[PDB]
Design a protein around this ligand. Structure first.
Ligand SMILES: [Cl-]
Length: 171
């Protein structure tokens, strides 16, 4: 259905301006596909994106939430071991640039308020290279809890949809 919905939009599109919205949605679905598969292999609960406020309340329900300035920020997921909060962001990319951008933003926006509240937090980004299927991890505590990441990844359907868009608008 995913693939067919995209195929129908790709068939229908006429302008590059509208096509870019299809390209962006295909990129997000590829991201979501990695997330679901990564959480399956890691045997953690899949969440699409959770607000920081909701993470704080799930870990520390007694927080005096209104005493703090919680930025509106939606990391893809999180792991609460019992002692450490692992903020988890997924990336699918052949470069690391977007990983670095998200890392910095998650660092300036999340870690300050977690420090005041007293929650030990780490930013973690897991990146799949869609061409090579190699997994890159950033986050030291995450690497010690999962040195084995048994993902079974196939991005070809996403590559096909985007190739179709590249072919239609190769002007
Ligand atoms: Cl992504």
């Amino acid at each position: 259905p995913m693939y067919e919905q995209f195929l129908q939009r790709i068939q229908a599109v006429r302008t590059a301006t509208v096509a870019k919205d299809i390209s962006a949605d295909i990129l997000e679905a590829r991201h979501d596909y990695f997330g679901r598969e990564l959480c399956r292999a890691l045997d953690i609960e899949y969440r699409n994106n959770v607000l920081l406020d909701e993470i704080i309340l799930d870990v520390y329900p007694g927080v005096n939430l209104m005493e703090y300035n919680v930025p509106h920020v939606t990391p893809d997921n999180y792991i609460w071991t019992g002692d450490m909060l692992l903020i988890l962001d997924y990336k699918v990319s052949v470069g690391h640039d977007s990983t670095e951008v998200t890392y910095k933003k998650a660092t300036t926006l999340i870690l300050p308020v977690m420090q005041e509240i007293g929650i030990n937090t780490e930013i973690c980004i897991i990146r799949a290279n869609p061409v090579t299927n190699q997994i890159s991890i950033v986050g030291e505590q995450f690497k010690r809890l999962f040195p084995t990441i048994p993902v079974e990844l196939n991005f070809a359907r996403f590559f096909e949809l985007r190739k179709m868009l590249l072919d239609k608008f190769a002007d």
